[PDB]
Amino acid sequence: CGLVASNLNLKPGECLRVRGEVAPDAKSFVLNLGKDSNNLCLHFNPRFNAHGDANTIVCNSKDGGAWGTEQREAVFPFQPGSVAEVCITFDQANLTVKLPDGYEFKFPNRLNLEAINYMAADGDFKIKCVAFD
Amino acid sequence: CGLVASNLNLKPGECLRVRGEVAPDAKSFVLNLGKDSNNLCLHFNPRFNAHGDANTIVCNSKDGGAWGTEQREAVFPFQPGSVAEVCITFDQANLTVKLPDGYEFKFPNRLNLEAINYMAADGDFKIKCVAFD
Numbered sequence: 635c636g637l638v639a640s641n642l643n644l645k646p647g648e649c650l651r652v653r654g655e656v657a658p659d660a661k662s663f664v665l666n667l668g669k670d671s672n673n674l675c676l677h678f679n680p681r682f683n684a685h686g687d688a689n690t691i692v693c694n695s696k697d698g699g700a701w702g703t704e705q706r707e708a709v710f711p712f713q714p715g716s717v718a719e720v721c722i723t724f725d726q727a728n729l730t731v732k733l734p735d736g737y738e739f740k741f742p743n744r745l746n747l748e749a750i751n752y753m754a755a756d757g758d759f760k761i762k763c764v765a766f767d
Numbered sequence: 768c769g770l771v772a773s774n775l776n777l778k779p780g781e782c783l784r785v786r787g788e789v790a791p792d793a794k795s796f797v798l799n800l801g802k803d804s805n806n807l808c809l810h811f812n813p814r815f816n817a818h819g820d821a822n823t824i825v826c827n828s829k830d831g832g833a834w835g836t837e838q839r840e841a842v843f844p845f846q847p848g849s850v851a852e853v854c855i856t857f858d859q860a861n862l863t864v865k866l867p868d869g870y871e872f873k874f875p876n877r878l879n880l881e882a883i884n885y886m887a888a889d890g891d892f893k894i895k896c897v898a899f900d
């Protein structure tokens with residue numbers, strides 16, 4: 635398991651910036667955002683070749699320990715053995731994950747928490763930098 | 768309570784860089800590094816106006832819940848209402864802390880852990896970014 639950060643107190647409109655290294659043999663990695671490990675308003679899971687999925691981004695939520703219904707994206711701007719930066723924010727309606735190159739994914743805000751207090755990295759993704767705005 | 772990060776897995780020679788804003792009315796802030804809250808190889812506590820101390824950097828360790836022998840540094844390159852960056856690394860003998868002014872102190876490594884897995888910030892220090900090398 636990778637880096638875990640709590641007491642983030644990231645409120646709506648504020649931007650959470652993460653830069654990390656994607657392993658050369660990356661099969662998938664995970665960014666979890668929410669209140670804690672049982673309450674995630676964003677489970678961001680790019681799958682290069684995992685659980686039957688190939689180059690597919692799987693997002694989901696976790697509410698009181700229970701997974702919600704997962705949502706999948708066709709575009710997959712991630713590359714094994716490379717540096718990836720994501721900027722993440724949210725409002726009452728959506729969480730937004732922006733890449734530098736202009737890619738933008740949205741996932742519906744299902745938990746409607748006041749803030750993001752929890753971030754966890756997992757899988758083949760070595761976090762090098764975290765910033766708050 | 769402020770930012771808490773775990774699973775840092777910071778090995779000797781690797782650099783932990785923390786940037787934050789020191790509040791205009793700051794009385795002190797704290798950077799704790801170690802295995803967990805009961806096991807700290809570095810308790811980094813700049814005191815502007817705290818515990819009877821003024822503009823004094825207080826360092827200590829915590830081993831199995833017990834404070835070690837306290838050490839203080841005369842120099843104090845921190846100013847209320849300003850941005851401060853601290854770079855921290857360690858070896859078998861010492862932790863090394865690099866200051867904004869380019870000042871550098873050594874603090875004895877008393878816990879001699881394999882890595883720094885735990886960091887906690889507290890007090891009048893709003894962390895803006897954390898980086899790993």
Ligand SMILES: CO[C@@H]1O[C@H](CO)[C@@H](O)[C@H](O[C@@H]2O[C@H](CO)[C@H](O)[C@H](O)[C@H]2O)[C@H]1NC(C)=O
Pocket residue numbers: 677679685692693694701704
């Ligand atoms: C009903 O089993 C579930 O099927 C979906 C579709 O393949 C699968 O993605 C899901 O795998 C789990 O999905 C969550 C996100 O919704 C997590 O990413 C988790 O890491 C992953 O294991 C699967 N549920 C399982 C295997 O428990």
Ligand SMILES: CO[C@@H]1O[C@H](CO)[C@@H](O)[C@H](O[C@@H]2O[C@H](CO)[C@H](O)[C@H](O)[C@H]2O)[C@H]1NC(C)=O
Pocket residue numbers: 810812818825826827834837
């Ligand atoms: C017995 O009082 C102790 O003396 C020094 C001042 O004489 C003071 O540093 C210390 O305060 C505590 O110091 C540790 C690190 O050494 C922590 O910073 C702790 O946060 C702080 O309260 C004080 N010892 C106490 C109050 O137990």
